[PDB]
């Protein structure tokens, strides 16, 4: 039945350690960075242009330019100083950087009936295949490449490639003419021409009312066959600051922390000597190494994170007029953000080690480790006709849809029509004819495999009490 | 008894009205026009000059926009303020800020914001300042506060011509900047086509980010004569409330006769609350009528002055609120009725041992939707807003589970966990069927 | 096994009496019959004038105005080419250079009373005028304005020979104030302007019909249009439509001559039922009544008796209409009349034939196939008939009380039976939660809850009372 | 366990086999074929002119001049770059500046004869001409208009050397009335306004469609478009297009003269797989001819040798039509044949490594008795047989009901199979319940309600059938032991 398990001192120290781990998960977090994602996103993704073009719609260069000398101008710059206020309240930290990265002239070497009206080839993008030569005047920072070492940055695989972390970049200047002038210099001679294989626009802002940045990273790949396809990362970061009450209680409460993850490592390690060999059979002891190894490398994160911040700032503030690269602590944030979920998923979990409940979590396992070694055997026929379907439907469809454009699309997209998030009208249109049969094959075949499945559990169930009880 | 019973429910099944949601569907659609485009305080004189001063004075004098609708009174414009405490952060990065959340403005400041004069009293001008009590009082719950009744007060209206007067004389003389909170425009019509009188507020609040969110509330209240609603309507609602008394009268007979045990019995709780539901409502009813009335009695004395109907339409919710509670205890009453005059046990025991799988059951449902609802907050509140708060996310997990809602986004944000989550939430969910068959097969086999 | 029941000799003649009935009802529908009506309603329902404003997206009066005058008259008349060069065929409208436009279009109007309600008691020195909601007594018979015309004087439903029209809100009658638009474009635009100069839409309007049809002899098919716009007594407009692709001429090539033989074979096969249903209800006094294989066979000799009087009737009615058509043009012909009630006999026919291959379903036998479930629904026929009224008193609560909290701010909430339909489509997985949750902050959450947990609660209970029967006895 | 059979030798060429195939078919497979379709369909579907008319949007025979002559010569010619400086490369479309534009394209349309049709006498004073739907039989080979022009005469399937082509309504044929537009903006933009100024598209047109094609050299890829405007007898136009990335040109690279290497050891490991398949006729002279995975190996081996078959006509064609556009350029080079008959073969290649893929269980097998279920094909033989024949006469009803009540206004019901789909989809949860109540607000509830009642009656029925039937045998089975 109902009742506290292995003793009564664990569990409480436990549910001091969930309570402790849900405040430090939620002193993070702000309830105002939806909104600011939202708002910073309608303004620079969302304002159209004279001819009517949003960023999210640029379908050529010359919508390109369109949108970088209209909106984007008209969106960086507002007044009512030597300074932006966004919206009155966001201050614009330093100054946006377009970047682009290029390949060469000649790379791909053309067919030989076509060599006498296509003179020269330009591949797709590849660090192996990349210009580094200066083009145009030859003259600024826009005409000539630097490696990715003096331009301090990192790669970003953003789309189809990627792409490296250095190339031709150009800072924009203080007031809202000097930027035109630079951006009408940059267009008449040609900047983007058919070597151009990506352009960054990169920014940021800073909110103190509600205390965020806003770090936005805008990318426009142009593939080896025209035309364009663009990206965007729009990402918040907290910078607490330690004044208030509620700052030293989570100061508090980080200590805290710290001394209980020390105290279970000592505890793990401590029980190991009793019986060492066994100690992998429970689960739960797995459960417990993966919570230690996940909260050291959340500490050691939130130490990193505390010194990248303030060398940004003192940059920041030591030499305006230059850029500021707050992208490697959005991206190394966001992914310290996606593990604490995890990690607090697991300390929920958790315990089930501790206060029972009957006839759910007491035959999970009991029927578990009796539905084996024939679904093991039926894991093994699933998979293999699931990526036959899979390969089945990149090849059928996947030129014209682009659920179906790559494997690990198709894989997810068969993950999605099992769950019932289907699109028919698309593959009807690819093919009329093979569209509704690869869609009906596959849905009867998985719900052959599922009751197949069920009626196996369910004969083994009989077969086991007829032997066990007329035996 | 059944005509009892029957009559109550058809007193709480009918009372429906057809009108409410059109007239409020053609409001909305008017005044809603392009509303939602106003992002600074900046923009919100070419909306009320363009899409708020052609639908207040339609075309036919003293009903908005197309007649039918007659307008009561002025039409109020409030603002509530934080205090201009100068800022200006500039070389202020070290060691930054913290602004108040402490501050409201309650001052007396004079044209333009400035200290005022030796008259230091609350005078009636749009810089003063107007308590709520002195004000009609009515706090609002807007979206992402519950802002005062108070606040800095104009009225423009019953007019085209004073409208616009005053919209170029509030503009040219900076009323509204960067210190305004939320902003309220407050009116009220009435319908005598299908007797309604609805209530209209404009809410346009501010955010963190310098911007604005707007909203609209309105609330509507039929003040037919709660007596003249026609023949055969009267009848049963007449026959209903005497059967009403009876029953009154019965419990409290049993009740002398009893002294103690009269809470012990489901019987006896279960039909004194319906009895004295029932009287409150038709006493509510009647009192709201009555204030209604005599709120109109201070319009017929002086018009061209602003009027809160809003204890009406309060006391109207309440009305409304006392039934769903009478529909539920009737609902509740009836199902006992009926399996006590006919062998109709519901559960064959199976749900129960005594004490247990009631609170062994409810805490494995509790445990998993906070897990899941806690993880999918973290990991999607920032971009998809059915995962804004923890509540929200609770309905939307619940809402996976039904089906109502789909997993689209949340696979084409994170593939590879949202992928994950959802296989876990599979295999728990089958493995709980599963054992469910066999333990129910190898029951009745042992 | 499959063994036959009632001899082979019933069995052959059922079957050919099917396929008989399914060459008739499928002989007659035509491939193109689909496109006809996307493209009609497309050029009517979404074309913009300057402004922008298309038929479905009208909200006011002015708004239509810029219909009928824009985007109206340059659909409904065409007289050029579109390199300006004129069309031959004079007179007359081509629209889309294929669809005769026949006769004249009319508009027409319902008007209620200046006094049809009072006032309220506070509101009688300011509001002069109550305007009730449409209802047939409470009907303005008065003329207006020039007080001269058609458009202004009141004509009955039997001047008027028409009939009824289910709309969005009530049902209509069938009279009011017409004007029938005349041949030319300019002529059209000169009455129309003439109409809104002269205040012909008032408070006191209610509904406003427009009605014309059209005729394809490429593919020989009628469209019939009605473009409808309710004013309601609260204000605002609701604009809907009728657009009737039908077929009422239906001999003209050999496929059709082909289909009178099928007719023919059809009446006798009529006959031969009926005559043989009397010997089996000679015999067997009110034993008869105890089959409900036979109360099937009375509905389908009845549905076909009806259908082929209806036959007939459109026979004579479609020859009065073409005549009147011809004899005296520029008049409107009543063409929805028809329209209407073929489309009711097209349904009808539908639902004849659903039940014809139920009757098939009949003629042969399986022993047990899908007999497991009403054996233990027969057997276990008590608690489960306890569960029924358990689940549809709290389902009827549960719609009564989403009513109540929901229903003035959603329209899914706003009738009785739109809950019951929204609660059941919940059960189905289709839902929009953030409307309600709009509505009402506090209550919508828990609605929703409480509700699907309802939901698990009863199947799951179910489940496990009929899987614990089919293992109570060994 | 993995019960391995058959010699496992057998298996380790099958896998040799298997994974020999995956590298001949993925290999000729681009990762950039996507965003070349995606961009080519987004220039010319997608682009507004002055009026707002794209190519989704036509819907009148105005319409389609103010599109062709507006955002269609716009997207074909390309001459100068965004800041209006001269491309180098002349006299020749760089479309995006990066896809060459070949040959000339080629606008070509079909008619519908005069007296293809009766008048029905009630109406046979006011109209005069019934013109039918599209056939073959009913079609006009007559000039019209000027009478002199290649756009105003009829030229035959066999002189254009055309093929059919499957449209939305119907399957159009190869002839017609064609224009081919040559050189620059400037001379095809005279030619389309003689075309719009003699009436071109009159009462007769029953179809009109656009060719042509581009090539491009960065990724050794082509994009075939064509774009359909059919012509109802109703009126109004329906616009579609089909538009292909192919890669008709395989070895320019360093792994494509790898990637032969591979396809070398193809053709022989299908002569080892048809050698071997006639041995088990020789043995079993008629017991070859009982299982199905000997019906398999049959199919298989007929779709490889289609496929050797047809890589030998690819090259022959290629080379020829290659050969034409260089020593006459200016006209058109009829590519969509290949296009089609391209993705045709890329459909079968992957219909044949999909049975390849899944034919893996006849070597490697386990052993859950058969399947984990013959337990329930003892008392299935005559029990599916009766559940089928009695579930599929009621779908197939509610499927014509459906149809004939709905159909004439929902797009889901146009069509009897498109009824059927409907209801497949209904059945998991997708529907679009508004439709159908908006199409009849009496028998579409009922429709629904019945419908999924009925889909629920007999989930429940075939569950706990299923699950009686055995338990009932292993009950009796326990009990004739003891
Ligand atoms: C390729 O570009 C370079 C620029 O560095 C230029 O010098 C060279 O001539 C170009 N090659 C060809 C074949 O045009
Ligand atoms: C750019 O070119 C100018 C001459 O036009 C030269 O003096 C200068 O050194 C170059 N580099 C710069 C400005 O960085
Ligand atoms: C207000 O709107 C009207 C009509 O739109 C216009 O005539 C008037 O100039 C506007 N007022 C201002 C201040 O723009
Ligand atoms: C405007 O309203 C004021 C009072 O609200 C009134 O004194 C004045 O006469 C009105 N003006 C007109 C033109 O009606
Ligand atoms: C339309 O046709 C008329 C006469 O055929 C001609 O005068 C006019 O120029 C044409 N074009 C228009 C009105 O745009
Ligand atoms: C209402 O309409 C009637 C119709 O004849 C008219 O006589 C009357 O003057 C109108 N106005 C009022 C206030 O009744
Ligand atoms: C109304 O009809 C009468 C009857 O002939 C006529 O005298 C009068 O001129 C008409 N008025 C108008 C505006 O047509
Ligand atoms: C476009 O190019 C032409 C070609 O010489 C030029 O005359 C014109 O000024 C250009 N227009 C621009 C750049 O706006
Ligand atoms: C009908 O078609 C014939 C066949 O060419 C043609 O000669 C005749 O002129 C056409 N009639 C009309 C009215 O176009
Ligand atoms: C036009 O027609 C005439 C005779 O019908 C013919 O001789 C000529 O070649 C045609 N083409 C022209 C003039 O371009
Ligand atoms: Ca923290
Ligand atoms: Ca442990
Ligand atoms: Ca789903
Ligand atoms: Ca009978
Ligand atoms: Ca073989």
């Given at each position: 039945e109902?009742?506290?398990?292995t003793?009564?001192?664990?569990?409480?120290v436990y549910?001091?350690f969930?309570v402790?781990?849900?405040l430090?998960?939620?002193?993070?977090?702000?309830?105002?960075?939806?909104?600011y994602?939202?708002?910073?996103?309608?303004?620079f993704?969302?304002?159209?242009?004279?001819?009517?073009?949003?960023?999210?719609?640029?379908?050529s260069?010359?919508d390109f330019?369109?949108?970088?000398?209209?909106?984007?101008?008209?969106?960086?710059?507002?007044?009512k100083?030597?300074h932006?206020?966004?919206?009155?309240?966001?201050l614009?930290?330093?100054?946006?950087?377009l970047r682009?990265?290029?390949?060469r002239?000649?790379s791909?070497?053309?067919?030989?009936?076509f060599?006498?009206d296509?003179?020269?080839?330009?591949?797709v993008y590849?660090?192996?295949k990349e210009?580094?030569?200066?083009?145009?005047?030859q003259?600024?920072?826009?005409?000539?490449?630097?490696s990715?070492?003096?331009?301090?940055?990192?790669?970003?695989?953003?789309?189809?490639?990627?792409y490296?972390?250095?190339?031709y970049?150009?800072?924009?200047?203080?007031?809202?003419?000097a930027?035109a002038?630079?951006?009408?210099?940059?267009?008449?001679?040609?900047?983007?021409?058919r070597?151009?294989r990506?352009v960054?626009?990169?920014?940021?802002?800073y909110?103190?009312?509600?205390?965020?940045?806003c770090?936005?990273?805008?990318?426009?790949?142009?593939?080896?066959?025209?035309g364009?396809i663009p990206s965007?990362?729009?990402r918040?970061?907290?910078?607490?600051?330690?004044?208030?009450?509620?700052?030293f209680?989570?100061?508090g409460?980080?200590?805290?922390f710290?001394?209980?993850?020390f105290?279970?490592?000592?505890?793990?390690?401590?029980?190991?000597?009793?019986?060492?060999?066994r100690?992998?059979?429970?689960?739960?002891?797995?459960?417990?190494?993966?919570?230690?190894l996940?909260?050291?490398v959340?500490?050691?994160?939130?130490?990193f994170?505390t010194?990248?911040?303030n060398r940004?700032?003192?940059?920041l503030?030591?030499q305006?007029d230059?850029?500021?690269?707050f992208?490697?602590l959005a991206?190394?944030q966001?992914?310290?953000?996606?593990?604490?979920?995890?990690?607090?998923?697991?300390?929920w979990?958790?315990?089930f080690?501790?206060?029972?409940?009957?006839?759910?979590?007491?035959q999970?396992?009991?029927?578990?480790?009796?539905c084996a070694?024939?679904?093991?055997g039926?894991?093994?026929?699933?998979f293999?006709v699931?990526?036959?379907?899979?390969?089945?439907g990149?090849?059928?469809?996947?030129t014209?849809?682009?659920?179906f454009?790559?494997?690990?699309?198709?894989?997810?997209?068969?993950?999605?029509?099992?769950?019932?998030?289907f699109?028919?009208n698309?593959?009807?249109?690819?093919?009329?004819?093979?569209?509704?049969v690869?869609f009906?094959?596959?849905?009867?075949?998985?719900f052959?495999?599922?009751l197949?499945?069920?009626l196996?559990?369910i004969?083994?169930?009989?077969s086991?009490?007829?032997?066990?009880?007329?035996? | 008894?059944?005509?009892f019973?029957?009559?109550?429910?058809?007193?709480?099944?009918s009372?429906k009205?057809?009108?409410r949601?059109?007239?409020?569907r053609?409001?909305?659609?008017?005044?809603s026009?392009?509303?939602?485009?106003?992002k600074?305080?900046?923009?919100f004189?070419?909306?009320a000059?363009?899409?708020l001063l052609?639908?207040?004075?339609?075309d036919?004098?003293?009903?908005?926009?197309d007649?039918?609708?007659?307008?009561?009174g002025?039409?109020?414009?409030?603002?509530?303020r934080i205090?201009?405490?100068?800022?200006?952060?500039g070389?202020?990065?070290k060691?930054?800020?913290?602004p108040?959340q402490h501050?409201?403005?309650?001052?007396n400041?004079?044209?333009?914001?400035?200290?005022?004069?030796?008259?230091?009293?609350?005078?009636?001008?749009i810089?003063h300042?107007q308590?709520?009590?002195?004000?009609?009082?009515?706090?609002?719950?807007?979206?992402?506060?519950?802002?005062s009744?108070?606040?800095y007060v104009?009225?423009?209206?019953?007019?085209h011509?004073?409208?616009?007067?005053?919209?170029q004389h509030l503009?040219?003389?900076?009323?509204?900047?960067?210190?305004?909170?939320?902003?309220?425009?407050?009116?009220?019509?009435?319908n005598?086509?299908?007797?309604?009188?609805?209530?209209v507020?404009?809410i346009?609040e501010?955010?963190?980010?310098?911007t604005?969110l707007?909203?609209?509330?309105?609330?509507?209240?039929?003040?037919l004569?709660?007596?003249?609603?026609?023949?055969?309507?009267?009848?049963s609602?007449?026959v209903?409330?005497?059967?009403?008394?009876?029953?009154?009268?019965?419990?409290?007979?049993?009740?002398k006769?009893?002294?103690?045990?009269f809470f012990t019995?489901?019987?006896?709780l279960?039909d004194?609350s319906?009895?004295?539901?029932s009287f409150?409502?038709l006493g509510?009813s009647?009192?709201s009528?009555?204030?209604?009335?005599?709120?109109?009695?201070?319009?017929?004395?002086d018009?061209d002055?602003f009027?809160?109907?809003y204890?009406?339409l309060?006391?109207?919710?309440?009305?409304?609120?006392l039934?769903?509670?009478?529909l539920?205890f009737?609902?509740?009453?009836v199902?006992?009725?009926?399996?006590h005059?006919?062998?109709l046990?519901?559960?064959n025991?199976?749900?129960?041992?005594a004490?247990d799988?009631?609170?062994?059951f409810?805490?494995?449902?509790?445990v998993?939707?906070?897990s899941?609802?806690?993880?999918?907050?973290?990991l999607?509140?920032?971009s998809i807003?059915?995962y804004?708060?923890f509540?929200?996310?609770?309905?939307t997990?619940?809402?996976?589970?039904?089906?109502?809602?789909?997993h689209?986004?949340?696979?084409?944000?994170?593939?590879?966990?949202g992928?994950?989550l959802?296989?876990?939430?599979?295999?728990?969910?089958?493995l709980?069927?599963?054992?469910?068959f066999v333990?129910?097969?190898?029951?009745?086999?042992?």
């Open positions: 109902l009742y506290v398990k003793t009564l001192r664990e569990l409480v549910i001091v969930l402790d781990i849900c430090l998960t939620y002193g993070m977090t702000s309830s105002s960075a939806y909104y994602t939202k708002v910073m996103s309608e303004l993704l969302h304002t159209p242009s004279d001819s009517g073009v949003s960023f999210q719609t640029i379908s260069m010359s330019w369109d949108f970088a000398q209209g909106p984007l101008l008209d969106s960086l710059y507002w007044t100083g030597s932006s206020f966004i919206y009155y309240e966001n614009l930290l330093g100054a946006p950087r682009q990265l290029r390949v002239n000649d791909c070497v053309v067919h030989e009936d060599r006498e296509i003179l020269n080839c330009y591949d590849s660090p192996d210009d580094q030569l200066p083009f145009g005047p003259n600024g920072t826009a005409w000539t490449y630097h990715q070492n003096e331009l301090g940055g990192s790669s970003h695989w953003g789309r189809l490639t990627s490296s972390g250095g190339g970049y150009l800072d924009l200047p203080g007031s809202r003419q930027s002038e630079a951006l009408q210099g940059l267009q008449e001679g040609l900047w983007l021409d070597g151009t990506v960054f626009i990169d920014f940021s802002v909110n103190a009312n509600i205390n965020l940045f770090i936005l990273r805008l990318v426009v790949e142009f593939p080896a066959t025209g364009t965007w990362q729009i918040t970061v907290k910078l607490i600051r330690y004044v208030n009450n509620w700052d209680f989570i100061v409460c980080e200590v805290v710290c001394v209980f993850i105290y279970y490592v000592v505890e793990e390690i401590l029980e190991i000597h009793l019986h060492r060999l100690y992998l059979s429970s689960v739960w002891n797995i459960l417990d190494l993966v919570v230690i996940l909260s050291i959340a500490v050691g994160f939130h130490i994170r010194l990248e911040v940004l700032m003192g940059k503030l030591q305006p230059t850029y500021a690269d992208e490697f991206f190394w966001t992914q310290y953000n996606n593990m604490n979920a995890v990690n607090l998923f697991f300390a979990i958790k315990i080690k501790y206060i029972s409940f009957n006839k759910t979590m007491t999970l396992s009991s029927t578990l480790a009796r070694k024939d679904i093991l039926f894991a093994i026929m699933f293999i699931f990526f036959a379907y899979a390969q089945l990149y090849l059928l469809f996947g014209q849809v682009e659920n454009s790559t494997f690990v699309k198709c894989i997810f997209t068969q993950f999605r029509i099992i769950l019932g998030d699109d028919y698309a593959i009807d249109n690819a093919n009329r004819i093979l569209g509704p690869y009906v094959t596959y849905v009867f075949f998985v052959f495999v599922l197949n499945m069920f196996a559990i004969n083994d169930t009989y086991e009490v007829k032997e066990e009880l007329a035996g | 008894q059944i005509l019973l029957t009559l109550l429910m058809t007193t709480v099944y009372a009205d057809s009108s949601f059109f007239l409020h053609a409001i909305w659609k008017r005044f026009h392009r509303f939602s485009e106003i600074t305080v900046e923009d004189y070419p909306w000059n363009g899409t052609p639908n207040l004075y339609g036919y004098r003293g009903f908005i926009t007649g039918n609708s007659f307008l009561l002025n039409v109020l414009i409030r603002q509530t205090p201009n405490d100068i800022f200006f952060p070389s202020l990065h060691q930054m800020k913290s108040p501050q409201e403005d309650r001052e400041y004079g044209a333009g914001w400035v200290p005022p004069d030796t008259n230091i009293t609350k005078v009636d001008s810089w300042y308590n709520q009590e002195s004000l009609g009082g009515y706090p609002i719950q807007g979206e992402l506060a519950t802002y009744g108070g606040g104009v009225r423009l209206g019953r007019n011509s004073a409208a616009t007067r005053v919209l503009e040219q003389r900076r009323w509204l900047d960067h210190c305004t909170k939320a902003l309220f425009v407050e009116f009220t019509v009435f005598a086509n299908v007797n309604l009188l609805c209530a507020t404009l346009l501010s955010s963190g980010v310098g604005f707007t909203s609209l509330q309105l609330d509507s209240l039929t003040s004569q709660s007596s003249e609603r026609g023949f055969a309507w009267i009848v609602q007449v209903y409330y005497l059967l009403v008394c009876y029953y009154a009268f019965i419990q409290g007979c049993r009740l006769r009893q002294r103690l045990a019995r489901k019987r006896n279960l004194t319906i009895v004295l539901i409150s409502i509510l009647m009192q009528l009555s204030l209604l009335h005599k709120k109109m009695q201070q319009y017929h004395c018009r002055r009027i809160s109907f204890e009406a309060r006391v109207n919710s309440a009305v409304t609120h039934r769903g509670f009478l539920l009737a609902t509740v009453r199902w006992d009725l009926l399996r005059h006919a062998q046990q519901v559960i025991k199976t749900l129960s041992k004490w799988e009631v609170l062994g409810i805490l494995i449902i509790v998993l939707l906070s899941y609802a806690m993880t999918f907050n973290l999607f509140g920032w807003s059915d804004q708060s509540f929200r996310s609770i309905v997990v619940v809402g996976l589970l039904m089906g109502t809602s789909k689209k986004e949340v696979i084409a944000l994170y593939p590879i966990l992928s994950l959802v296989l876990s939430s599979i295999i728990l969910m089958g709980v069927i599963i054992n469910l333990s129910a097969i190898l029951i009745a086999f042992g």
